[PDB]
Each structure stands twice: as C-alpha cells, then as structure tokens.
Amino acid sequence: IVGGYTCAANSIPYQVSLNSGSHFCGGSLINSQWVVSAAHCYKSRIQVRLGEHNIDVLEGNEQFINAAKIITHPNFNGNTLDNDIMLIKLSSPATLNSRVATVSLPRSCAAAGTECLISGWGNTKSSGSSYPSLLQCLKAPVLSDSSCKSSYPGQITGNMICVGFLEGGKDSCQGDSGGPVVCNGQLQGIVSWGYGCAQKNKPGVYTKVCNYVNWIQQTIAAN
C-alpha cells in the first residue's frame, strides 16, 4: 500500500496474510471457515494467518491455520486476469473474536465515488521496494467505468473495477494481491493488478466481487 497509513491494531479484523514460507498475498475472511483471495495468489501449499498486525512478530492474537481447499474460479484466465478470485477453506474454523472477524459479501455493486478501505502488507513505495511488518490502510474512492477503461485500453472486463487516484501517489501494490476493498461494511473488491503502483493515470484494478456472490455461496455450500 503506497500513500497509506499504518492501521490501528486489529482494526481490519477480516484481513488475512497468505503465507508459503513468507507473506506473498492477502485475503478476506467471509465466514469462520472460508477466505476469499485472488486466483493468481494460487499455490498448492498456503498457510493463512489471521489476527495479524505485525507479520514478523508474534504478538498474541494470531491464529495460523493451513489452507485445506484451494479453489480458483473455473474461468480464471492467468494472462488477462479475468475472474481473478479464489476461495480457501481453512482446515479448522477460526475462533471469532474482536480481532478475527468476518466481512459481509455485497448486497449490490458499489457506485462511482463510493469510499472504500483497502489494506495489506504490500510494498509501500512507487519507486523501489519496501515491505512493512505492520498492516497498511488506504481510503480510496471507486472510479468510474469510464476512467478505469480509459487508463487501461483493452484490458478491463466487466469483472474489474478501478479504485484509487488518477493523479497517483495512493494505490495498492505488489504483496497486497488478494486483499480487501471494503466499502460500507461490504467486500466489493479484491486486489488484482496495475501498471507499477501509485503512477499517474494507472489506478489499481480490482476483482468486482458483486459479480460472484452466487459463485461464492454455491462453492461454500458444495464443499
């Protein structure tokens, strides 16, 4: 997260870190056994870490639970990043408390201009690299379909939305993939991709969660 702030401890209690020996992607807890992430975060071996604030220090609210089921959307395309969504079923239910909590799926798509919260432990720099111990937060508006498609001609499907600032600055970045965009107590986005991070006319592009509610509910019920 470039241009963000260090979140208050456990203030994003639905945020998880996906860990295969180190942090590599984020995820969102949507019920006690299931996490939603990006499909390009797919690996055969993932450990999910809930309750985290400082990912390099054991502070005492952590729950470390291996991924059991790891299911990418059947129509995911790795070249275009269309349908970039994944579900993880934890091998045991998380213990829900004030620091580990669920985020509601969307009850509709978010309007241009709706304010969201975006979070992760990704790179905090737009030139060079810096990986934080502490979870980073960014408040950012959903951008019009028009601005989004203008920024990335030929690359925006109806399953993608842009969130952030045409002027750059403030953006998500590498290491934030799979993480939450939460707007009005709903998950409306999953960190997915961009040209660089925090560059002019190259806003963050996010998986449009409102398109998949049925896919998610069905995948949960069948597994």
Partner 1 sequence: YTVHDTDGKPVLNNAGQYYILPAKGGGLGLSNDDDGNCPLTVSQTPIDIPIGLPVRFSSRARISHITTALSLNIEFTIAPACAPKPARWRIYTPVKISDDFSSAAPFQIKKFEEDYKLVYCSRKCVDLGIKIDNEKNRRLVLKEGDPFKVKFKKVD
Binding site members for Ca(2+): 52, 54, 57, 62
Total residues belonging to the chain = 223
Q: Give the separation between CA 65 and CA 89, rounded to whole angstroms.
A: 10
DSSP secondary structure, 136-202, as one string: EEEEEEBPPHHHHHHHSTTT--TTEEEES-TT-S-B--TT-TT-EEEETTEEEEEEEE-SSSSBTTB
Enter the DSSP assignment of 25: E
CB of 22 or CB of 92, closer to partner 1: 22
Q: Give the separation between CA 75 and CA 181, rounded to whole angstroms.
A: 22
**Catalytic choice (20, 40, 126, 144):** 40
* Near partner 1 in 164-193, by CB under 8 A: 172-178, 191-193
**Catalytic choice (17, 53, 73, 84):** 84
Residue 53 a catalytic site member: no
Residue partners of 12: CB distance under 8 A and separation at least 6: 117, 119, 135, 137, 180, 182
Binding of partner 1 at residue 72 (CB under 8 A)?
Answer: no
Question: Taking Cα atoms as reference points, which of 14, 54, 21 lies closest to residue 36?
Answer: 14
Total chain residues near partner 1 (CB under 8 A): 35
Alpha-carbon torsion, ordered 149, 167, 39, 116, to 10 deg: -100
State the nearest-atom distance from the C-beta of 98 to partner 1, in Å.
28
State the nearest-atom distance from the C-beta of 39 to partner 1, in Å.
10
Here's the x/- map for Ca ion, 29-58, by CB under 5 A: it reads as: -----------------------x-x----
Residue 82 a catalytic site member: no
Binding of partner 1 at residue 67 (CB under 8 A)?
Answer: no
Residue 177 a catalytic site member: yes
State the nearest-atom distance from the C-beta of 193 to partner 1, in Å.
5
Binding of partner 1 at residue 20 (CB under 8 A)?
Answer: yes
CB of 21 or CB of 158, closer to partner 1: 21
Here's the x/- map for partner 1, 188-207, by CB under 8 A: it reads as: ---xxxxxxx------x---
CB of 21 or CB of 74, closer to Ca ion: 21
DSSP secondary structure, 44-105, as one string: SS-EEEES-SBTTS--S--EEEEEEEEEE-TT--TTT-TT--EEEEESS----SSSS---BP
Query: What residues act catalytically?
Result: 40, 84, 177
Binding site for partner 1 (CB under 8 A): 20-25, 38, 40-43, 78-79, 81, 122-123, 128-129, 131, 155, 172-178, 191-197, 204
